[PDB]
């Protein structure tokens, strides 16, 4: 189906004369495959996934070269953003950045991204047309003008519409047993006694990939959203993901409730009921 | 693959 490649950069300034912290990780869909850490001893772009280890020295020496430049250009941005907001040198601030491309089912380009953040808040971001910029505040407005003058948008669009989907298509085909795979949820539901009158039915969804999933609790009517409890989708640590939804029910009426599970691996939605 | 050109803020 639809796929994506994402790069996440985290630049954190250290108080005083402590060298800035830089972290860069790469994600294809929901799978991380590369990393870079400024506090590491290797000082190279490292493989996280085994399927990207196919690449020879030229790739890794190249990716190492380009990410070093990404670190230095962000060390500068930390200082520049400090001046824009009149901040002291004593405090610690964070600069974040993401760019990547989205493809269709036929792997044709769909969407491109390029965003910035400072101290947890949006700074400047490339609009969907890949022609304009969204500058939140008057400080970012300076960057917007600087990038409009140097025409950064056009050259970025070439990468997103072109080189990005070229890279993603390479990654998808190199290790297709890992990226193109779809692991279906292994579902079950457990029953628990709350005091005595009420009871908790928890619908479990385990060992599934991709991470996108929908768990709803429905009665004989339909979809009882609210009262039901939902938790954030969590990684199992083996590449797969976990998530459960639960709702408290009166005793005996446990047979009335059902759990709907929708996933990419599921050809049809699953309707699960509790039977004593 | 990351960008091959960098630009300050």
């Amino acid at each position, epitope marked *: 189906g639809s796929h994506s490649m994402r790069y996440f950069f985290t630049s954190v300034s250290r108080p005083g004369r402590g060298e800035p912290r830089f972290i860069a990780v790469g994600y294809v869909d929901d799978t991380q495959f590369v990393r870079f850490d400024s506090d590491a001893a290797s000082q190279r772009m490292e493989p996280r996934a085994p399927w990207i280890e196919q690449e020879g020295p030229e790739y890794w020496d190249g990716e190492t070269r380009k990410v070093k*430049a990404h670190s*230095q250009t962000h*060390r500068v941005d930390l200082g520049t953003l400090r001046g824009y907001y009149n901040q002291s040198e004593a405090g610690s601030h964070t600069v974040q950045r993401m760019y990547g491309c989205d493809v269709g089912s036929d792997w044709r380009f769909l969407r491109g991204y390029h965003q910035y953040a400072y101290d947890g808040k949006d700074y400047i971001a490339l609009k969907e047309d890949l022609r304009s910029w969204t500058a939140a505040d008057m400080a970012a407005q300076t960057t917007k003008h600087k990038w409009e*003058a140097a*025409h950064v948008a056009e050259q970025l669009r*070439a990468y997103l519409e072109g080189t990005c989907v070229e890279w993603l298509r390479r990654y998808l085909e190199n290790g297709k047993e890992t990226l193109q795979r779809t692991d279906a949820p292994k579902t079950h539901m457990t029953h628990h006694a709350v005091s005595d009158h009420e009871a908790t039915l928890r619908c479990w969804a385990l060992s599934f990939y991709p991470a996108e999933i929908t768990l709803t609790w429905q009665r004989d009517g339909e979809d009882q959203t609210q009262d039901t409890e939902l938790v954030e989708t969590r990684p199992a640590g083996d590449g797969t993901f976990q998530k459960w939804a639960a709702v408290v029910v009166p005793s005996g009426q446990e047979q009335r409730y059902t759990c709907h599970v929708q996933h990419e691996g599921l050809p049809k939605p699953l309707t699960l009921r509790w039977e004593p | 693959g990351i960008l*091959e*050109f960098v630009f300050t803020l």
Partner: T-cell receptor
Amino acid sequence: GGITQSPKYLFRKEGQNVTLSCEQNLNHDAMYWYRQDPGQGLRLIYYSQIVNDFQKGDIAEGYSVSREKKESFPLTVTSAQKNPTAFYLCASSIRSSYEQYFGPGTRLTVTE
Amino acid sequence: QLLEQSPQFLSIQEGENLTVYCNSSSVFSSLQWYRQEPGEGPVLLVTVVTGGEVKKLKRLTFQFGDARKDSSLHITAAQPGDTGLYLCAGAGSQGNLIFGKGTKLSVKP
């Protein structure tokens, strides 16, 4: 503001190292080095997209640079260069891959 | 990523009109034109961005290809002062500029 090269003319003995200086106040992050033979075109030696980072060019052998300061970008012609004698040019752009502004240039001649 | 310029050498009479070409198989986000006199630093003439762009500088007239793969430099009423090397430059992917080998123009009086 502008971009400067010093000196205009440069003369050294064979095998003795020499360093060329390109300095700016145009507030540019990217700085470039080209060498140009008579009746020829520009050949990229070294270039830095940002301070504290640089990268080789097409004909980077025999040369070495440093980008510790945003304002300057020193080019060192090592003794290992087979044909040092050329016309050297420094250039800079507000960012990498954009329009570059060249310096006056420096003529280097190495004799036996 | 290559930029090719034709003709290499052009020697025409004063007062006439000419055209210098810069062609490439690659697409360019931005393209620059330079003019270099012997022994001196190249002077930036123009930077074209949008496809089909038409910009004028004095007697010089610049044209950007619709697909942004070609460019042309048109001089109107050529003067002996126009004598020099005209270079075509485009935005390289590796954080550099791709240069053409230039067109040496000789405007004879």
